[PDB]
């Protein structure tokens, strides 16, 4: 109507974008537990086979659920909780 | 053929907000006022610009004390 519009009378959101950001596709230990009842080696290939992460992305594993199986996980990155939860069930958190 | 008047300020919406018997939480504004037309009673504080606010949960009760109008909060009991 003529007054200063809502998008012009408020401050712009602070910050910048950092185009060199490394973004990861994340998978939780609960999903791994559900999808791998028999355990076994777990890499990015089978993580995309069971439809858990995108095809050709970077995978980081997060420790949300509960892990109760012996599993040998390989991934780009691991969180502290996920690594501890994998190790406690007698598995190896191999980092690429 | 002109007047020197015609300008005024905005209304400040003062007055009693919670009347006697109403249940309030701690910190609710009970009355907005300029002076101390009402003085704080038990469990009622006085703001910088002279608004009275509850200091504890309960039921508002007005009263008098030595000729002074006061606002108090009555400690409603457990259900």
């Amino acid at each position: 109507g003529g007054q200063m519009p809502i998008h012009m009378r408020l401050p712009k959101l602070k910050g910048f974008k950092n185009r060199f950001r490394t973004e990861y596709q994340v998978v939780n230990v609960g999903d791994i537990n559900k999808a791998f009842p028999q355990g076994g080696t777990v890499g990015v290939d089978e993580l995309v086979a069971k439809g858990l992460v995108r095809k050709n992305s970077l995978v980081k594993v997060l420790g949300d659920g509960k892990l109760t199986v012996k599993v040998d996980v390989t991934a780009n990155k691991f969180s502290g909780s996920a690594r501890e939860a994998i190790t406690a069930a007698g598995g190896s958190a191999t980092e690429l | 053929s002109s007047s020197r008047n015609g300008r005024d300020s905005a209304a400040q919406r003062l007055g009693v907000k919670r009347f006697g018997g109403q249940v309030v939480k701690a910190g609710e504004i009970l009355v907005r006022q300029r002076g101390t037309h009402f003085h704080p009673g038990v469990n009622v504080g006085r703001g910088g610009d002279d608004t009275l606010f509850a200091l504890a949960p309960g039921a508002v009760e007005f009263g008098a004390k030595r000729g002074r109008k006061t606002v108090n909060i009555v400690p409603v009991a457990r259900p």
Binding site: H7, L10, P11, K12, L13, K14 | -
Partner: protein, 63 residues
Amino acid sequence: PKAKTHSGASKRFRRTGTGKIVRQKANRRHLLEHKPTKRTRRLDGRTTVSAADNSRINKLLNG
């Protein structure tokens, strides 16, 4: 033709993990000396866009 997002709206508003639209508060860039710290502290951070502006803000953000 694709629909173009409003540049100012994109720069002013963001969304949360559930869909709340979030803005910043005004009266903070300058003339800060006579503003008390209590008033300065309520003017930072983020707040949810009020229900009146939700529709127009969503329109500007999407297209």
